[PDB]
Design an enzyme around this catalytic site. Structure first.
Site, PDB file in Angstrom:
ATOM      1  N   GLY C  89     -23.678  24.499   3.602  1.00 47.09           N
ATOM      2  CA  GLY C  89     -23.921  23.624   4.761  1.00 47.09           C
ATOM      3  C   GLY C  89     -22.675  23.129   5.467  1.00 47.09           C
ATOM      4  N   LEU C  91     -20.663  24.772   7.618  1.00 49.73           N
ATOM      5  CA  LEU C  91     -20.736  25.122   9.029  1.00 49.73           C
ATOM      6  C   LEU C  91     -21.657  24.137   9.784  1.00 49.73           C
ATOM      7  CD1 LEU C  91     -20.017  26.902  11.465  1.00 49.73           C
ATOM      8  CD2 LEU C  91     -22.032  28.302  10.962  1.00 49.73           C
ATOM      9  N   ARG C  92     -22.843  23.889   9.250  1.00 53.60           N
ATOM     10  CA  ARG C  92     -23.790  22.953   9.851  1.00 53.60           C
ATOM     11  C   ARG C  92     -23.143  21.575  10.100  1.00 53.60           C
ATOM     12  NH1 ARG C  92     -29.068  23.073  11.329  1.00 53.60           N
ATOM     13  NH2 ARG C  92     -29.455  25.153  10.450  1.00 53.60           N
ATOM     14  N   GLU C 116     -20.718  37.354  14.723  1.00 56.80           N
ATOM     15  CA  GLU C 116     -21.981  38.077  14.567  1.00 56.80           C
ATOM     16  C   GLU C 116     -23.056  37.469  15.469  1.00 56.80           C
ATOM     17  OE1 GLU C 116     -21.127  38.002   9.736  1.00 56.80           O
ATOM     18  OE2 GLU C 116     -23.204  37.973  10.517  1.00 56.80           O
ATOM     19  N   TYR C 120     -25.234  31.632  15.822  1.00 55.40           N
ATOM     20  CA  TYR C 120     -25.153  30.455  16.688  1.00 55.40           C
ATOM     21  C   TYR C 120     -26.419  30.054  17.453  1.00 55.40           C
ATOM     22  CZ  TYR C 120     -20.159  30.166  15.540  1.00 55.40           C
ATOM     23  OH  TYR C 120     -18.958  30.042  14.893  1.00 55.40           O
ATOM     24  N   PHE C 396     -11.626  34.083  23.294  1.00 53.72           N
ATOM     25  CA  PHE C 396     -10.942  32.938  22.709  1.00 53.72           C
ATOM     26  C   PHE C 396     -11.571  32.596  21.370  1.00 53.72           C
ATOM     27  CE2 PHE C 396     -14.287  31.253  25.435  1.00 53.72           C
ATOM     28  CZ  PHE C 396     -14.945  30.369  24.574  1.00 53.72           C
TER      29      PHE C 396
HETATM   30  C1  LIG Z   1     -20.192  32.148   9.524  1.00 55.80           C
HETATM   31  C2  LIG Z   1     -19.655  31.151   8.494  1.00 55.80           C
HETATM   32  C3  LIG Z   1     -18.711  30.193   9.217  1.00 55.80           C
HETATM   33  C4  LIG Z   1     -20.855  30.372   7.922  1.00 55.80           C
HETATM   34  O1  LIG Z   1     -20.485  29.268   7.103  1.00 55.80           O
HETATM   35  P1  LIG Z   1     -21.481  28.556   6.046  1.00 55.80           P
HETATM   36  O2  LIG Z   1     -20.916  27.236   5.586  1.00 55.80           O
HETATM   37  O3  LIG Z   1     -21.709  29.479   4.877  1.00 55.80           O
HETATM   38  O4  LIG Z   1     -22.868  28.312   6.837  1.00 55.80           O
HETATM   39  P2  LIG Z   1     -23.925  27.165   6.423  1.00 55.80           P
HETATM   40  O5  LIG Z   1     -23.987  27.012   4.931  1.00 55.80           O
HETATM   41  O6  LIG Z   1     -23.628  25.836   7.065  1.00 55.80           O
HETATM   42  O7  LIG Z   1     -25.299  27.772   6.965  1.00 55.80           O
HETATM   43  C5  LIG Z   1     -25.991  27.247   8.077  1.00 55.80           C
HETATM   44  C6  LIG Z   1     -27.094  28.228   8.463  1.00 55.80           C
HETATM   45  O8  LIG Z   1     -26.543  29.342   9.143  1.00 55.80           O
HETATM   46  C7  LIG Z   1     -26.884  30.544   8.471  1.00 55.80           C
HETATM   47  N1  LIG Z   1     -25.795  31.533   8.527  1.00 55.80           N
HETATM   48  C8  LIG Z   1     -24.465  31.331   8.259  1.00 55.80           C
HETATM   49  N2  LIG Z   1     -23.794  32.462   8.575  1.00 55.80           N
HETATM   50  C9  LIG Z   1     -24.677  33.375   9.040  1.00 55.80           C
HETATM   51  C10 LIG Z   1     -24.535  34.683   9.495  1.00 55.80           C
HETATM   52  N3  LIG Z   1     -23.368  35.309   9.367  1.00 55.80           N
HETATM   53  N4  LIG Z   1     -25.650  35.382   9.920  1.00 55.80           N
HETATM   54  C11 LIG Z   1     -26.900  34.790   9.889  1.00 55.80           C
HETATM   55  N5  LIG Z   1     -27.035  33.493   9.434  1.00 55.80           N
HETATM   56  C12 LIG Z   1     -25.942  32.802   9.016  1.00 55.80           C
HETATM   57  C13 LIG Z   1     -27.246  30.162   7.043  1.00 55.80           C
HETATM   58  O9  LIG Z   1     -28.169  31.055   6.463  1.00 55.80           O
HETATM   59  C14 LIG Z   1     -27.824  28.778   7.243  1.00 55.80           C
HETATM   60  O10 LIG Z   1     -29.186  28.894   7.559  1.00 55.80           O
HETATM   61  P3  LIG Z   1     -30.246  27.778   7.118  1.00 55.80           P
HETATM   62  O11 LIG Z   1     -29.969  26.517   7.900  1.00 55.80           O
HETATM   63  O12 LIG Z   1     -31.624  28.301   7.436  1.00 55.80           O
HETATM   64  O13 LIG Z   1     -30.104  27.502   5.639  1.00 55.80           O
HETATM   65  C15 LIG Z   1     -18.940  31.878   7.335  1.00 55.80           C
HETATM   66  O14 LIG Z   1     -19.800  32.825   6.743  1.00 55.80           O
HETATM   67  C16 LIG Z   1     -17.574  32.478   7.630  1.00 55.80           C
HETATM   68  O15 LIG Z   1     -16.398  31.719   7.468  1.00 55.80           O
HETATM   69  N6  LIG Z   1     -17.523  33.756   8.024  1.00 55.80           N
HETATM   70  C17 LIG Z   1     -16.263  34.471   8.175  1.00 55.80           C
HETATM   71  C18 LIG Z   1     -15.545  34.183   9.496  1.00 55.80           C
HETATM   72  C19 LIG Z   1     -16.519  34.108  10.653  1.00 55.80           C
HETATM   73  O16 LIG Z   1     -17.177  35.108  10.977  1.00 55.80           O
HETATM   74  N7  LIG Z   1     -16.611  32.929  11.275  1.00 55.80           N
HETATM   75  C20 LIG Z   1     -17.352  32.745  12.512  1.00 55.80           C
HETATM   76  C21 LIG Z   1     -16.521  33.053  13.758  1.00 55.80           C
HETATM   77  S1  LIG Z   1     -17.486  33.053  15.299  1.00 55.80           S
END
Ligand SMILES: CC(C)(COP(=O)(O)OP(=O)(O)OC[C@H]1O[C@@H](n2cnc3c(N)ncnc32)[C@H](O)[C@@H]1OP(=O)(O)O)[C@@H](O)C(=O)NCCC(=O)NCCS
Ligand SMILES: CC(C)(COP(=O)(O)OP(=O)(O)OC[C@H]1O[C@@H](n2cnc3c(N)ncnc32)[C@H](O)[C@@H]1OP(=O)(O)O)[C@@H](O)C(=O)NCCC(=O)NCCS
Ligand SMILES: CC(C)(COP(=O)(O)OP(=O)(O)OC[C@H]1O[C@@H](n2cnc3c(N)ncnc32)[C@H](O)[C@@H]1OP(=O)(O)O)[C@@H](O)C(=O)NCCC(=O)NCCS
Ligand SMILES: CC(C)(COP(=O)(O)OP(=O)(O)OC[C@H]1O[C@@H](n2cnc3c(N)ncnc32)[C@H](O)[C@@H]1OP(=O)(O)O)[C@@H](O)C(=O)NCCC(=O)NCCS
EC number: 2.3.1.-
Lengths: 396, 396, 396, 396
Positions: C89, C91-92, C116, C120, C396
């Site tokens: 959570g 990211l949330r 991906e 968002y 960006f």
């Molecule tokens: C994307 C990222 C930031 C997610 O962080 P996280 O802390 O694991 O996400 P959360 O635990 O807060 O999840 C929040 C929700 O988003 C969803 N989610 C997170 N990443 C997702 C993804 N890649 N695809 C689909 N759903 C995703 C989770 O399933 C969760 O859903 P829920 O509310 O139904 O339980 C992380 O996987 C990451 O650092 N990725 C690598 C770098 C990157 O791609 N960053 C984004 C740049 S735009």
């Protein structure tokens, strides 16, 4: 293990060995047609103790050599040893016996197409023709201002179904084969077989078409997997005009990106284009291989270049005799001698020289033909050259 | 749009055009070294109104032709027109001016390496050498019993660092270039440049090694992406013994699966092996292109084959004069005439014939050289052949 | 686990997380330059208990929307959670906090580029621009008789070094960005960074060139691995004439087979050619994503199509309020109401509609926007369309 | 060379030309079925002097255009010139004659599918529909919470054998084709042909299955070489509910990794998913091309957008007349005038505009449609838009 001529009961076992040894095995029905070209005593089999574990045969052919001379030629084919009996000398035994039969029957030369390049050198076969694949991106191809037949008015070429024009293909081919070294007579049974390959195949090859000119033809079909590639299986042109007209038509195949053909190194096609580089050499390989069976008979049968002045030498073939060789006015006389050899070579090397595909100077640089006289080498090079470039007829 | 010789202030604009036109652009430092070979008035630029939108130059070279004759040769290079100014006749203008300068300066021939095959034919350049890539799967390669230098005792070849043996490479190359048609003199600045390419490059090319024999050398390096491929950049052998010894050593490169080299069609390498098929032709292309600037000077300079008997003819070059040509005893005399032409060809065709890479008979079959006398054609074919196979020196 | 604004001591830990999360990580020096665009309180980090395991920030941007209106825009970026702390959570939490800060700071919209497509939507971001890669085989490309600027006389385009013409690129870009929806202001630090990418890289990217017109420019470089592909990184044309002239020049890049560019779906390039099919769509993807932060502020800021007659409706955004929306004479008024909703949609859907990249009718067919009035849907479709096609500025 | 209508004896020669010109040639039996749609005098052949060297024909079709209006449409097809007779004006001659016959017969429009994009523009055909291939990695695909039909209880969709449900496919298709621009009537003979393609082929295509809903169907089969790819050949949905239900079922094909379909740019599929990016655009191409035969008849037949207020203009089609065009209340009136033109375009451009696939503003940016009034351009853009997105029916 016994080696003898097959009886009618051996042939199913031979066809099994063949199916297991050749992926491109033409099948028992086609094999039975080619079989008409194998003379009595033209085949050997080796049986375990019973079943066939080795086979080899030759077919009666007619081969054109420089000077438009046609030689009776033993075409070795269907050569195989079972995976269970290999490296045991069966090939050596079978080749020794067939060569004995071939020599005794009075053939001056034997020939084959090699499955690999390393097998037949030791049995006296040298590669005598060169396969040269050209691939043309026809989207860029433009004919040179000099190329024959560029003006207005109808084409001399017709797009036809091969099976409806057998008589015309036969007559053009018969003209072609008599005038080109490497030419082979194509008997009726092989035209039967060829024209049967022209039909579309149950998920196999696509339909074959033909381009027909009074003095040449091209047979072609779209590649099975590359749908923008037309593969020309055979192009037989008796005149330069026919060759150019046929290429104009092929290059007009608007649905295709590429046209390919397996041809010879001196194909004038690239010189027909404004960009010679567009006719890309995409593959090169030995074609026909030759074993000279009787040295004097073969050397005296061939024509030689008229440009080189008369000269005399002594040629030793490594296990094939030593000969006084005199070449003048396009002809050779080749008689026994015990005089000191001026040129020495293995039998396979003579085969490579014989149709003009390889230069003596090139073989000499590799020490495959030995002389101390560089002038003699130049003279041999010139004499053995073929005025008409050597081509490859059909595989057997 | 003005066309003139560049001043020192034009060169940064030329280097920009070059960087934008040639991906393999050697860079300003290397370009500045090659620049030492460009004579005063050897370059032209076209400026818009100001900035360079077109360029071309020639370098002073020495080219070996059949008979071991060395000709002063203008090497055209660095030819480019900006993408903003193309199909506007700038190339035509620049080529016309340089050819005028080259002809007036007394060069009998000009030469180039072509970026595409369709550009230079119209300016009188014909492809004169053939690049022939051989790739050998060295895991299967075995030397023929006939191949030189098979017995026991040390090798004559040493594995060395190229930069530590400049003097020896220079001397071997200088011998090689004088005896082979296609040979070019390699000035000190080009050895400076070559030996600087031998070092490993920051994530670029891997280190170059050398195999050194008293009479030949090979420079090679592992391919950047295919780590089991050794690419031979240059193999210069003065003797057949040196050529074989160097190949024995290369084929000994146990860490490699494949060895490739860009060589000539008559490389004897395949004949050194028990399986000629293992030296696979993997690519073929035009190498050096020739424009004969002065027809009589070029034709009289070259040696001809001694085997062909004396003969006389009348040759017309399409916009290059008509000449009584007499060839006898390896030499030509070529004088003005208004007698009826027996042979006609465009200037580019003569260039293709000149080093022996292409047969007159082949050009004639494409109607690029016209005669009605088939005997004359045979005689021309024989006379223009090169006893020593034509090779390609270095790209420029 | 604590969530707060980073101190100067947190940044090395953030740069580590970034290096580990983004393969294309621009590096600490470049990241430090972009950092100038992040306002005080524009970043959050999550620390374990100590070390950074999560981060996210926004940059102050200016985005052009339909009607040439420029909005202050929070550009989310540098978003990452350590592989050791994911699906917990973070990211949330980080998104909730930044959105609170962004909304309180008075930004009407936030934007991002998505790693991906699945992340968002749930945070209210909808894809708002479409990336459309065109690849042109320039060997076949011919300009249509109708295309601007075909006649004789000089080109208006110059081939230049990017770093020598910063001022001109800046001024053209500044004009472009104000007139195109999707346009972003490019601050000095980003031009600093851009022009530093133009140099050849130590075994990395090849040199970048520029084509410059008074009203447009193109920056391009040869692909690192496909040496016959020129990749246009950016083409900014203020006029149709500039766009055509630049493409004429690019298609003149004789050394290349192919030119590619990442552009927008309404790029007129294909219509400039005699064969529209030659401009091949080779890749398609979401570009900029939008989260509308304040519904009334965003809807009232934008211009609407004049063609649609005045109309009034009630729009409910799922957790974003219900509004009386009146659109007439190219303008919207959007006020609170508790009247029954006629149109309902999630916040992300409004973002997708906002720049005109997606039709309401298309979203409605997927049930992403719900109404029972098909006339209302047609009217919304027409009103929200952008007269000037939406483009993507820079990532960006 | 004579041009006339074929007699029954010409058809074997036409089928030969066809086999040689089209790799996908449907064969003489299928061609004989399509032939039922060619009216008397609907075909032309060119004979050498005798044999067919050129052919072309049209079929009687019914095409749906914006406003659910159905137009009689001449479907050009089977167009070919022998490789031996190309670039001789045979296509020009055949097209001129058929267009004369088509115009005289009273067709307001002609249509075709183009083998290449460069052929038909000059004959007045503009690409009017866009083929858009989507490929979905169904392993990641999840439906959005908003997507129709997500709850418990049975599916409305059945997995069936196509050949057992002809009547139902016919009725759904007939509904679909009347409501979508681009829709074509599919006569009984084409359903005969379609349903015959459904069987597994002797080493050819794998068996076709169908997914059937009361208001839509999908026909699909596993790719011959990629065994984890299902290719949807046709998906005809009359309602949004049917479209979603069918995609739910396709995405349920657990044995597959990927599902692909050739669809239209406004397919709502991506918006049905939580990750829009998973529906990847993998190919894009012109589909149906249109030649407007009678400008006033075509322009008056179509419906226009109601949103744009009444307006009047003067449209000149380059060799197709000048017209006072008044568009109001969804309808056009288009009468002769010699007043000054306000909009000018070639005939092909009108064809591209006609079904709403291309915006006037986009064509105008390429100078393919010329006006000086930017307001007029906006109005044309809006009026010519199709409320129902244009789709492609079947290839002919
Ligand atoms: C994307 C990222 C930031 C997610 O962080 P996280 O802390 O694991 O996400 P959360 O635990 O807060 O999840 C929040 C929700 O988003 C969803 N989610 C997170 N990443 C997702 C993804 N890649 N695809 C689909 N759903 C995703 C989770 O399933 C969760 O859903 P829920 O509310 O139904 O339980 C992380 O996987 C990451 O650092 N990725 C690598 C770098 C990157 O791609 N960053 C984004 C740049 S735009
Ligand atoms: C080629 C083939 C006929 C050889 O049969 P064989 O009985 O194993 O050969 P032999 O035992 O008589 O060997 C004779 C010599 O040839 C050599 N030899 C055989 N096949 C060879 C090959 N493929 N490459 C190189 N050398 C080969 C052997 O090493 C042996 O050399 P040696 O005299 O120095 O000991 C067999 O491997 C075969 O049936 N191959 C499959 C089908 C085929 O390719 N046939 C040839 C069609 S042209
Ligand atoms: C090749 C190049 C120099 C041509 O310049 P240019 O000014 O456009 O050529 P011109 O306008 O003078 O054209 C002269 C003729 O050559 C032809 N031509 C030019 N380049 C050609 C090519 N690549 N292939 C075939 N024909 C070509 C033209 O069609 C024209 O023919 P025409 O007389 O019938 O009208 C240019 O395209 C270029 O800079 N290429 C990139 C770098 C390069 O490859 N240089 C050559 C190094 S060997
Ligand atoms: C396409 C085809 C029918 C053309 O026939 P053709 O008789 O050679 O064409 P024409 O001589 O009448 O040429 C008319 C014009 O169209 C042009 N043209 C013809 N085919 C073209 C193509 N493939 N791409 C671009 N231009 C083309 C010609 O250059 C000519 O232009 P011009 O008026 O400026 O001189 C022929 O090449 C063919 O049978 N192709 C194979 C099958 C096929 O693709 N048919 C079309 C099915 S939609």
């Amino acid at each position: 293990v016994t080696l003898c001529s097959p009886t009618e009961d051996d042939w199913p076992g031979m066809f099994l060995l063949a199916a297991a040894s050749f992926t491109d095995f033409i099948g028992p029905e086609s094999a039975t047609a080619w079989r008409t070209l194998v003379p009595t005593d033209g085949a050997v089999v080796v049986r375990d103790g019973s079943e066939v574990v080795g086979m080899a045969l030759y077919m009666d052919l007619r081969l054109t050599v420089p000077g438009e001379v046609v030689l009776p030629t033993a075409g070795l084919s269907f050569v195989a040893v079972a995976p269970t009996h290999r490296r045991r000398g069966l090939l050596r035994a079978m080749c020794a016996e067939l060569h004995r039969r071939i020599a005794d029957s009075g053939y001056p030369v034997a020939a084959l197409h090699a499955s690999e390049g390393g097998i037949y050198g030791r049995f006296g076969y040298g590669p005598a023709t060169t396969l040269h694949e050209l691939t043309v991106d026809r989207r860029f191809a433009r004919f040179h201002a000099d190329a024959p037949g560029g003006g207005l008015g109808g084409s001399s070429v017709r797009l036809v179904r091969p099976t409806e024009h057998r008589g015309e293909f036969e007559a053009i081919y018969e003209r072609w084969r008599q005038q080109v070294p490497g030419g082979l007579l194509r008997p009726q049974v092989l035209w039967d077989e060829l024209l049967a390959e022209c039909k579309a195949a149950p998920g196999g090859d696509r339909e074959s078409f033909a381009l027909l000119h009074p003095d040449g033809y091209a047979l072609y079909r779209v590649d099975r997997t590359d749908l923008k590639l037309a593969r020309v299986s055979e192009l037989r042109a008796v005149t330069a005009d026919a060759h150019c007209a046929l290429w104009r038509a092929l290059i007009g195949l608007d649905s295709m990106e590429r046209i390919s053909i397996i041809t010879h190194p001196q194909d004038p096609l690239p010189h027909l284009l404004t960009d010679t580089r567009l006719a890309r050499t995409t593959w090169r390989q030995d074609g026909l291989w030759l074993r000279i069976m009787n040295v004097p008979a073969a050397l005296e049968a061939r024509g030689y270049a008229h440009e080189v002045g008369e000269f005399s030498t002594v040629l030793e073939v490594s296990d094939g005799g030593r000969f006084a060789l005199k070449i003048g006015d396009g002809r050779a006389r080749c008689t026994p001698t015990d005089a000191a050899a001026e040129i020495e070579m293995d039998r396979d090397v003579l085969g490579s020289l014989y149709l003009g595909a390889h230069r003596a100077s090139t073989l000499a640089a590799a020490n495959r033909l030995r002389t101390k006289d560089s002038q003699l080498l130049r003279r041999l090079d010139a004499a053995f050259a073929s005025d008409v470039p050597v081509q490859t007829a059909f595989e057997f």
